[PDB]
Write a protein that binds this DNA or RNA. Sequence first.
DNA 1: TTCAAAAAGTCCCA
DNA 2: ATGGGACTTTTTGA
Length: 543
Amino acid sequence: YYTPKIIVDYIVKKTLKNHDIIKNPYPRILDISCGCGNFLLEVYDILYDLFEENIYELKKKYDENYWTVDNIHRHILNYCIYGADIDEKAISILKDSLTNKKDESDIKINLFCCDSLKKKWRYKFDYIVGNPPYIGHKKLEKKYKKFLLEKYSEVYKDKADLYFCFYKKIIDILKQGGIGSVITPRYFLESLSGKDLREYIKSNVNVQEIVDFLGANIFKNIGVSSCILTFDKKKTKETYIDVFKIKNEDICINKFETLEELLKSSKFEHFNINQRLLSDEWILVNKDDETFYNKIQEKCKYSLEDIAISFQGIITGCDKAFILSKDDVKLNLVDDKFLKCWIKSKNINKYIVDKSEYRLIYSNDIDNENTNKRILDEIIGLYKTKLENRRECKSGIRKWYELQWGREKLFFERKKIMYPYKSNENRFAIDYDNNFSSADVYSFFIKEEYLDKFSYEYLVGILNSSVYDKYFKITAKKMSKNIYDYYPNKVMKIRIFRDNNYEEIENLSKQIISILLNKSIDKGKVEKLQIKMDNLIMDSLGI
DNA sequence: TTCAAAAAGTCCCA
DNA sequence: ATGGGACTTTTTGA
Ligand SMILES: CNC(=O)[C@H]1O[C@@H](n2cnc3c(NCc4cccc(I)c4)ncnc32)[C@H](O)[C@@H]1O
Ligand SMILES: [K+]
Ligand SMILES: [K+]
């Protein structure tokens, strides 16, 4: 995963541009996932320029025979550059690349082929740079995950990622007054799994700068969203973070010769965040958005979690075995008591759901194999081998033809609100048709004790408003270009209000629902009603 | 027993 | 061929 050169140079310049080579001519620069040496080779070039530009000052202050230009190459490799990686071939290539920068006496190069997370590191380091590996909870082998849970528990639990541990290792082995700069996924900035990691970073290092690329495609043909984190262990009372957040995700990364030109430009916005004021959540927004977010939080007395019951959709474990088109002839084998309406995330619009085109065979209600042999033999059994490889089938908890996570039917077969799990905008709809769905659609229904305060029509009105689209996206988890995570761990934290505008907001919502359900939809008037509703909500929240 | 999180997403076309 | 757009499964720890 080759890191773009402009970012590599920026990271190295970040850690080394103001190093006092005269005061300390023995800086230790480390990359614990160096690979072929994208960062370390640049570190060599930056160090070599630094030594040659101060070669005569060094010669005068120290051993004058040791400090010559001819001796710079040797000194850098013996005492300055350190790298670690698990790939033997990459280390071998990097060793040759460092050697080719210039046998006399066989210089030794501090490159280790090892697990960076298991190595007994004999000393701390002045500067650490690089791009660690990212491995999620699905693609990480179970034997290694037990080690991470037992030894890296301060940052790695549950659905945490591998690069959390590289953050902990880098922070642990950084010298006092040292500087670290890495490029990692951005998701830990907001994700629920990153809470322990954020607590660790906040209370161990001073975060100098965060570069957030949002959904920009930094790595070509890689579906990941990146950020650059720069931190130090310097004694300072400032504790203020420079945040450079991109404004246009469509931009290409090579607009200028250097990254810092892009950051200072009109493609990025800059603002400051007080690190001491960071809660367990990192709300990195400008003053206008902070005021906007704080107004809504203070004005709203209730949250969605207070008034609603949230649940994830069906997880069959093999969709091809249980989901059929409503026009599929094989449904003539299945009694209608077994069939449920099935929708995908794209079927969720604002305020209403598209008509179902798929049916779910709720195979849990099938009592035994002998009574409905045709359904099992001709429909579900076509994927029996894959069905039996599901975890709950291996342990015997689930029968091979049963849904892996069937949930409760009564939760779905009722009036409820559904929203897609990943979307570019708020899309909350009222479901009237007892729709079932997979985990790409989340549902909630209102608690009985809050039905006389909040109706479904009022909720979809304010939740689909432009005010709440901006409001939710302030702290939402940015996944990829024009995609946010609409998950209960943040959707249920949305705060809602009840005031003098309740009735008209609800009435406008009913009008929109009435038009959206017509045969000849005058979608233009829906937009006009939405604008009027947004004005009511902004009036209610005083913004 | 059984909840919900997780993009080095995935797949496609031009 | 690559880059950009539409769309989103089930494995997994707790
Ligand atoms: C996306 N970028 C990479 O994967 C690079 O990082 C190196 N890289 C991976 N993982 C490493 C590690 N520890 C974790 C580890 C080790 C062994 C098995 C397992 I599963 C996990 N330590 C040291 N370099 C490690 C790789 O060799 C590439 O150059
Ligand atoms: K001298
Ligand atoms: K991206």
